[PDB]
Amino acid sequence: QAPYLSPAVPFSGTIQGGLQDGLQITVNGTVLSSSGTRFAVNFQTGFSGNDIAFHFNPRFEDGGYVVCNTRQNGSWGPEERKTHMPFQKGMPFDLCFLVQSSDFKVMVNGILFVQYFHRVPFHRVDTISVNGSVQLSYISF
Numbered sequence: 001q002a003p004y005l006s007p008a009v010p011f012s013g014t015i016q017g018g019l020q021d022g023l024q025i026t027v028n029g030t031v032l033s034s035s036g037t038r039f040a041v042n043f044q045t046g047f048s049g050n051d052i053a054f055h056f057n058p059r060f061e062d063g064g065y066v067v068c069n070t071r072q073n074g075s076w077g078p079e080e081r082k083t084h085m086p087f088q089k090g091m092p093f094d095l096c097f098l099v100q101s102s103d104f105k106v107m108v109n110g111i112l113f114v115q116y117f118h119r120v121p122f123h124r125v126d127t128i129s130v131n132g133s134v135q136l137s138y139i140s141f
């Protein structure tokens with residue numbers, strides 16, 4: 001699949017073929033100053049945003065932390081949080097999502113940040129969306 005170049009945010013785009021084992025999605029962007037306090041990347045089914053297999057949500061609030069969770073039929077499950085923010089505003093970053101049979105491997109600038117085991121079959125994911133206080137340079141597959 002061709003990369004989405006300079007997509008505007010918010011953004012929603014189809015992931016051709018749907019998520020598949022071995023697929024690596026790269027999200028290159030920059031956290032802005034003066035927008036909001038958080039941004040997110042969502043691996044979802046459809047554009048509704050009601051069913052999100054994997055929600056990666058960095059929050060520049062309360063000291064800085066990232067929320068990882070799944071949303072099924074509009075219902076958010078138990079959150080997984082990490083308190084060591086690997087993001088810095090005004091600095092471009094490479095957010096890499098490696099899809100494996102049992103989990104998502106998430107790397108920030110080549111450094112493994114989190115591991116999220118699939119709560120729902122990843123084959124159900126065909127859409128990636130990004131919103132919040134972030135500017136995108138590109139999304140590659």
Ligand SMILES: CC(=O)N[C@@H]1[C@@H](O)[C@H](O[C@@H]2O[C@H](CO)[C@H](O)[C@H](O)[C@H]2O)[C@@H](CO)O[C@@H]1O
Binds near residue numbers: 069
């Ligand atoms: C401490 C705690 O459980 N707080 C939660 C909030 O995180 C939650 O905010 C939502 O969180 C989901 C991901 O779990 C999405 O990021 C969503 O955009 C947030 O609004 C709220 C609402 O569900 O519930 C508690 O406050």
